[PDB]
Amino acid sequence: XXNXXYX
């Protein structure tokens, strides 16, 4: 990944 969130 490498992105974040939170979903």
Place this chain on the structure above:
Amino acid sequence: XXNXXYX
């Protein structure tokens, strides 16, 4: 805020 990211 409250959500995340990262942009």
